[PDB]
Amino acid sequence: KISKIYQIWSKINCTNLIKFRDIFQTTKFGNLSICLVFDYYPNSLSLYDYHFVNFPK
């Protein structure tokens, strides 16, 4: 099913859907953790951030 998810999102291709890069279950935080990666975009906000949560409105 991990490979099946790799199929279901490695083929998932759009613009506003930021592209699935890869996933991995590590043991590095102390615990086990299924860490996934995507593409960093600078200065990530919501619209509610862009107006209401964060300055300015």
Partner 1 sequence: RKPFFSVDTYSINYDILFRDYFANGIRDTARREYKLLTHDEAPKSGTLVAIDAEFVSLQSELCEIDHIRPKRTALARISIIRGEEGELYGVPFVDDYVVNTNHIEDYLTRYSGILPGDLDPEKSTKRLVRRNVVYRKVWLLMQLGCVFVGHGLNNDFKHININVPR
C-alpha angle 2/36/25, rounded to 5°? 60
**Interface with partner 1, residue 3, by CB under 8 A:** yes
Residue number, 33 or 54, with CB nearest to partner 1: 33
- Whole-number Å distance between alpha carbons of 28 and 35: 10
CB atoms within 10 A of CB 9: 17
Contact between 15 and partner 1 by CB under 8 A: the answer reads no
Total residues in contact with partner 1, by rule CB under 8 A: 8
* Beta partners for residue 24, in sequence order: 35
Among 8, 12, 19, 26, binds partner 1 (CB under 8 A): 26
Could you list the residues that contact partner 1 (CB under 8 A)?
Answer: 2-3, 24-28, 32
